[PDB]
Structures are given as structure tokens and as C-alpha cells.
Write a protein that binds this DNA or RNA. Sequence first.
RNA 1: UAUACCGCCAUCUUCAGCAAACCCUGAUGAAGGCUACAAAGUAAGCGCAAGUACCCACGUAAAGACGUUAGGUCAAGGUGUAGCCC
RNA 2: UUUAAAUGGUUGUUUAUAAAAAAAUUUACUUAAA
Lengths: 69, 51, 63, 343, 225, 132
Amino acid sequence: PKKPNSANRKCCRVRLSTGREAVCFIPGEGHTLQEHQIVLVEGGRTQDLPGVKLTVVRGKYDCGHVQKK
Amino acid sequence: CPICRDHKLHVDFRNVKLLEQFVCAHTGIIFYAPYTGVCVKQHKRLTQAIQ
Amino acid sequence: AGSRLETVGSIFSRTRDLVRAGVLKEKPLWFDVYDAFPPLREPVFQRPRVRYGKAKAPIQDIW
Amino acid sequence: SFFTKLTADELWKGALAETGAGAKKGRGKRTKKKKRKDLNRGQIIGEGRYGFLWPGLNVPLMKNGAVQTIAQRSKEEQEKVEADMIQQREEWDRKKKMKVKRERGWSGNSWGGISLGPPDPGPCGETYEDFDTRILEVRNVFTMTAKEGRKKSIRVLVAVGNGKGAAGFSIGKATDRMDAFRKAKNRAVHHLHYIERYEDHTIFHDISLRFKRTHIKMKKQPKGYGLRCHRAIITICRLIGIKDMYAKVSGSINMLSLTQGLFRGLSRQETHQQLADKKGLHVVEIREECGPLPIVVASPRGPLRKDPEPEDEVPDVKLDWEDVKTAQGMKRSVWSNLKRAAT
Amino acid sequence: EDSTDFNDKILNEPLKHSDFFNVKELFSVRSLFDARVHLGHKAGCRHRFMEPYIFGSRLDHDIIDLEQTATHLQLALNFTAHMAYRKGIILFISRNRQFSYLIENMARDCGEYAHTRYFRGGMLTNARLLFGPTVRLPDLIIFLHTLNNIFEPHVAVRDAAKMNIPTVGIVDTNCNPCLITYPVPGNDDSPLAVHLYCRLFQTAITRAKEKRQQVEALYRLQGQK
Amino acid sequence: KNRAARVRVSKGDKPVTYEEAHAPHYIAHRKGWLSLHTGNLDGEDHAAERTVEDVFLRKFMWGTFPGCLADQLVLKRRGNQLEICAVVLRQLSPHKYYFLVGYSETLLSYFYKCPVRLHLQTVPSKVVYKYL
RNA sequence: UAUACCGCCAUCUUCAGCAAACCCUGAUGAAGGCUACAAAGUAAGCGCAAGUACCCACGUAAAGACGUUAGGUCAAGGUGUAGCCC
RNA sequence: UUUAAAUGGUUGUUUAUAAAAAAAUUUACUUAAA
Ligand SMILES: [K+]
Ligand SMILES: [K+]
Ligand SMILES: [K+]
Ligand SMILES: [Mg+2]
Ligand SMILES: [Mg+2]
Ligand SMILES: [Mg+2]
Ligand SMILES: [Mg+2]
Ligand SMILES: [Mg+2]
Ligand SMILES: [Mg+2]
Ligand SMILES: [Mg+2]
Ligand SMILES: [Mg+2]
Ligand SMILES: [Mg+2]
Ligand SMILES: [Mg+2]
Ligand SMILES: [Mg+2]
Ligand SMILES: [Mg+2]
């Protein structure tokens, strides 16, 4: 992230159904996403990461719900 | 809400003094529910009793 | 109490209204005299402005 | 060692750490800020763990007209005394844990619209129990000093009024918030306005005024309309005693300009009597709810003019576009005329 | 039962007469003219608020209208007498150092108070801290000179209005009369003028105090029998 | 800045006694000594044992009369006698004072093997010299 | 863990300022408040000063506020928090 | 008017109320009897 924060935020690059390729933040603690997997993305910018304006939806297609604690 | 917090306040067409509190004395219009805070259920009962 | 807002109204209007409102319990010693024998002008604060343009003082030269 | 034990005052001063570098310049902020407990509170002189009963100290000196001798409470009796002592502590501790319900102002954590109570009585047996005080703004202003750097001060705006026309406001400044409240509250009662209320519920006419960059447009309203104005104006109106009014604040929403502008406009309103006297004509009120009945609200105390006021065919008056635009049904707003709680 | 009668016969009675103390006889327009009361400052020193009181400018020297002076002085002397009759504390204020000794004597002679010295900040608005919690402030303040020694309004004029104390003031052509309750337009420089003001206000106060004693005595003698 | 035994200025609301208001450089100028014995005179012995005894006695009396002492003790030694002069408050009942005087005089006489007297002087409240 | 603190201190200080409580000014903004032939300041308290010690009223000691450097010291002793307990 | 004199890592330096209460001891010998 940009100042004054510090972290390693888990992002992915997806090819959207429109054909454009964009970087999408994966929310939650722990993700099992691999290349060639299908995800549903939504809006909402990650205020830390400049230029990340998409978010992966947890619990749709391959991206599963975060595992309890 | 004001009506549901006191179980002794009965919304009845005969309890005219209670019903009067929920009507404008100067214009005669029944206050809409947000005005007094009564829930929709009690506002509907109050309106019917006033009529 | 009393009102120290000397630029709002006059000492009379302020005293009259506060006694009227019940803030001042007793009228001041001078109030009844002012009411009976008021001044020609009510002493209200005014701001002196300079004259611009064609505004001139009406004072005439004594000849 | 018995010789290394300190007193309670020394032990608490060290443990609390109220004076230190951590508190000088907003350096350390801890929610877990430790609180002092007086450990001598519930202790009785002569009461110990062994449970001895000392005649004349722990227990009465004489019983049945005879001097008591040294005795010791039985094991089970001491257990009860010790258990009761634990219960008493828990109860006392419970009292401190309880939170008293504070009436919130405009917001949960906001100071605006909280009552400060009546102004303090004057030195000469003077009282202001009729007046009520309400905070309008609390600001943390700062200046820079050579020795300490940022010096934090509190600026507080409070209004006071008895609800019967007499209302005022003042600013109070102090390092402590309590001192700022007191100074503002006590100074406001010495700077009171008198507001002319029409029928003791509204203003005599519509007032449009600009104080610096703040614009206030107030409209006279009938009974039952309520206060449909800026939350700060609502607070001031309740202190003045105005029950029905509408006001729109435009331009800068500075609280000091708004308050000073409101009192400037309300103080400079012309009553119906003042109008009749100035014009030498009857002031006749026409009410729609009373049909064509002419209600004379004021008559000229002096002589009544016999010439009718000249009726200008077209009035050369400055109209506010916002008013005209609303009358023509051209003003759509999803935020106007929204249902709100009784004010 | 007796208080209301006492107040009516004593406190309310004088307020029903136009000139109870007969102050009109103390001065005439001729006497004011002979004291040079009409001589104002040069036109370049004129205050805008004094224009209604100026008769004209004679070779760039403002002439004060003594016909208005007479009406204004009548009201000022009447108000002063009624306050002295009511046992009000009268304070004379002046910063003209040519007349400080005269004014301080005049106050002592009529049993009143004078403040001719440097006016310290808060004398009136912070009196309870300066003098004491039970100090009584003046009921009337008479300004023989309304300007301080830098030709600006004496601070007490503003502070008197803050404390709701009525003020009488001699206002020359360079003075600001807006906050003076009973302004009296006149020359405040010439000794003859200042000597007349002092004689007039000292007489009105002395006359009123004696009248209060006479009226009270008659009420008491009659009360017994 | 020096710290030793200096009650520092507050907001003018902290009541201090006469002893607590005077810093250590006044101990022979404006205030006297809280203990008078011969140990510290030139050529005199047993200054150390007198010091330990004084420290114990001040602790003993603080805990034996909890919340009663209104100022510091004045310890006096004349020959074999030890005299403790304490300014106490008027809150504890007189019966409890008499019990504690009889108890402390006896217990301390057996502990330090000398006749000990306790002279109590009661005050309605703490004597305030100034508000710092 | 002195970056939780008491205690005892260094430093500016070979300084003279800190300041409660009021009052007034700036259109009732952060803030500001003196002129002696005086124009809004009054000011408790603290420090300086004065007193006291040493051989004087000199000098030297002592004293030296509020704050500044999260300055020094958990190893004088005490102690908050966390940790160890074959 | 009048020599020269560059530099100083990142983030951290400001808001919600205050405080216990208790309880009494209960006025004047010696003695004895059945
Ligand atoms: K961060
Ligand atoms: K520790
Ligand atoms: K950071
Ligand atoms: Mg988001
Ligand atoms: Mg909340
Ligand atoms: Mg002049
Ligand atoms: Mg040193
Ligand atoms: Mg440190
Ligand atoms: Mg010396
Ligand atoms: Mg030294
Ligand atoms: Mg010194
Ligand atoms: Mg450090
Ligand atoms: Mg270190
Ligand atoms: Mg470089
Ligand atoms: Mg840098």
C-alpha cells in the first residue's frame, strides 16, 4: 500500500468478460484462487492500493467463503 | 415506541384524550408516524381509532 | 442581570425590555425619570461614515 | 523488608503515571488509563485476618455493664465476615461500573445541543434559574508557543434563554473544557437580547439577512408548523420561545456567523405596533381560515392618517429566485419536505 | 400600607411636573452666550454627528446653536436634579487637566463624586473585582469633557452604556454624542464656559438635595399629627 | 531543577502544611527538626541506631493510627525517655484513641526497652499554611 | 519496558518569566490588551527579588518557577504492564 | 558598494462528566441477708 500503511495485500489479474484485463483485490484472510479460475468481480476501490478499483466476490464460482478463524 | 412502551395506553376510539395527542390541535391533521415515532402498526391503529 | 450590548438599541430600550421580560426584578433608579423626561434623541449607537462622491456637509458659512 | 514499604499516596502516584513525558504533548493515548482506588475505604480499625475482638476498639468496651475480655471469632464466624467484606466490595465496585444515561445532543458524540444547566448565581444574591443554557459548538483551537509548541485551547459557543424572549450567546475560552463552559455560560447572561415574538410563537415578518458570508432567510409561519430550520437555529429558537418558523441557511455555515446573524435579524424586526405608529395606519390581518374578516392587529397610537397609502401598480421589489422557482413548481428536491421528528 | 403612600407623595410626585426644581431660571441664552458656549472648533475638526447642532461656520469656526443648547441643557439639568433628589450617586468625569482641580472641588462641595484622573481599564465593567462585591456603581455620570487627551471619546462613555448608566455630556463640535443620553452641545474649552457648567450642575444638585429634605420633613411632621 | 522534598506549584488549590511548604534549604532557617536526640552531636555515639528507631516509629504510628495523623511526628529523646508528639484529627472516637495510646505506649516500651509516652494533640482539620 | 512511572537529577538558568480568576478589543475568528502631560486592563499564587548561611550592607554559597531535550536512571529503593517458576 | 559557506531517510506530537457511608456510651459507696 501507499503511505502511511504497510501490508502485502493479495491481488489478482483477471480478464473480464468485456475483454479488458484489470487488477482485482481479493478480500478476506486466505484465498485459494489459481490461474484459469472463474471469479465474479464487483466495484469498490481498495483505498490503500492506488489503481485497484475492483474486488473479487467471496462465495461465487471458484472463490469460496473465508474459512472461519 | 411511545404506544408500545406503555402497556396501559390502549388505542381505542373511546380513549379520546389519548387520540387527541396524535392530532394537530391547530390544523386537525393526524401526525405522520415519524413525527411522534409510533411504529407503523400502532400508527395504523391510531388512525383507525381517530376516524 | 442587565445587557452590556451597548450597540443594540439604547440603555432605555434594553432596560425596558428586560424589566418587561422579567429578567430585571427591579427597575433602576433612573428609569422612571427617563420615562417622564426623555431626551430629544434616543441614545442609539451610530457608526460615523466618511462622505464620498457629491455628499457635502449642510453647514453654511455665516455672512 | 518492612523498611522498603512506601505509603499509598506514593504507590498510586507511581502506578498511575499521570505526570510524565507520555502526557506532555499528546504522546501516549491509552484507553486503559488506570484509576485510583482508595484501599482504606471499607477497612475498620482493629479488624484483622485472625478475627480477634479487642474490647474498646473493634467491639464495644462494655457489654452488660461489664468490661469485655479479649475474644476471637470462631472459624465459621470469621468466614462470614470475610465473605461479607468481599460482597460489599463487589457491590461498591458495581456502582462505579454502572453508566448513567446521558441525554445526547445532535449526535451521540457531539457537544452541540447539550444543556449546561442554569447560569451560576451572581455574587449579590442574583439568580438565573429561569434561563437555560445549551452548547452550540466546541472547538479545539491551537496556538504555537516558543517553549511548548502546540498549545491546545477550547473555544465554546453557548446560548442562553428563558424561553420568553430574552436570549443571548457568548464565547468562552479556557485550557480546560469545564472552565470554558462556565465562562461562556456566565458571560452570556450579561449580553441578553430581547426578541419580539408575534403572538409569542413566531416572528412578525419574514427576515432575509446576510451576516458576512452567511445568508439566513426566515419565514413567518402559522401555529403548528414547528421549527423547520438548522439544528442550531432550532436550539436557539427554543431558548427564545419561537415555536413556528422556517429558515434556510446558505453560503458559509459557520456557527459563529449563523448565531450572530440570527440574533442580528431577530433583534431588528419591526413589530406590528411599530409599523402602525410609523405609518399612522391600521394594520389589518387577513387570515384564510377566517375568510374575509378584517382583524386589526395594531392601530396608530397617535393620529390616524386620512390618505390611503399609494398603491403602486407594479412593486419594484427584489424577488428571491428560490421563492419564485418554488411557487411555480419548478423546484424538485428529494431532500425537501421530508418527514422528521417533532421539533 | 405606608410605603406606597410615602413613595407616591415623595418619589412619584416630582415626576408629574415639567420643571419641579425650577432649573429653567438658572440660565438664559444670554448667559450662555456671555460664557462663550457657542464657540466651537474649526470646521476641519467637525464630527459628522454634531452637524445638527451647529448653527454655522464663521470664517471656518463652527458656531454652536445656543437655541438648541438651551433646550438640551434644560433637559440635562432637569434629569440631574431628579437623580440628586432621588439620592442617586452622581460622578463627574473629565480628562481636561486645566479643570481637574475645579471639577474635583465642585464634586466635593455638592456632596458628589469626581473622576478627573487616568481612567483605568474596567473601573465600571469590572467594579466588583476592583472595589468589592457589594460596591454600588454611580446612578448618573456627567461628562464635562467627553474626549480623552488623544481627542478620542472617553472610554467611560462606552462603558457607562454597557452598564446601563445614563450620561450627561457637554459635546463640542469635534465630539461624538451618539451614546450620550443627555447631550448638551457647547464649548468645552473656554474657562468661562466650563465655570458656568460647574456652577449650573452644582446648583441643580444642591437645590434638589435640599428639596428632598424639605419634602421628607413636611411628610413626617404631617404623619405624626 | 531540584526536586528533593519540594511540593510543586499546582493551580492554587492544593493545601500544604507549614512543614510541607518549606524545601530542604530551610531546615535550620524557617523550620526545625522533626527529631531531637544527641546521636548527631560531635563526639556522640549511636546515631545509626537512633535513625533506624525513628524510621520505624514513623511507620508504626502511620499504620497504627490510620487516617488520623494530621502532620508529621515530633520525636523527643531525653535520657532514657522517648516522647512521641502527634497532631491527630477529631474524627476517631475518644475511646479508640485511649485504647491505641495504651496499646502503642506498652508495645513500644517492650520493643525498645525504654519508657515511651505518646502525647496527642487534636485539631478539627488539617492546618493549611498556604494553597499551592 | 526510563517510550508506563514515583523517587533523585542534567539542561537552557552566567534566564525572568509562568499564571488561576475576571474585564475589555478584534462586527463575539485563530488571537490581542501599552503610551505617566497615559489611550483597557485589574491581577491571587509561583519564580526572580527580599530575607537567611559564611567574615559586612561586599563577595561567595544557597536559591532558581512554568516548560524544553519521550534528556539520565527499572542496576539505590519502590512500582504499572508483560515474562520465568525443577 | 565588498570573499566564499553544500547536506540532514520513513511513519508517529491531542476530548466526555466528577464524587461513599457510618456508629455509639448511656451519672453518685460500703455491706449484707435468707
Ligand atoms: K498505518
Ligand atoms: K518494573
Ligand atoms: K507508518
Ligand atoms: Mg471498500
Ligand atoms: Mg454513538
Ligand atoms: Mg472643545
Ligand atoms: Mg543544580
Ligand atoms: Mg526519559
Ligand atoms: Mg547578599
Ligand atoms: Mg549554585
Ligand atoms: Mg533569591
Ligand atoms: Mg530516552
Ligand atoms: Mg539509555
Ligand atoms: Mg546529497
Ligand atoms: Mg528532514
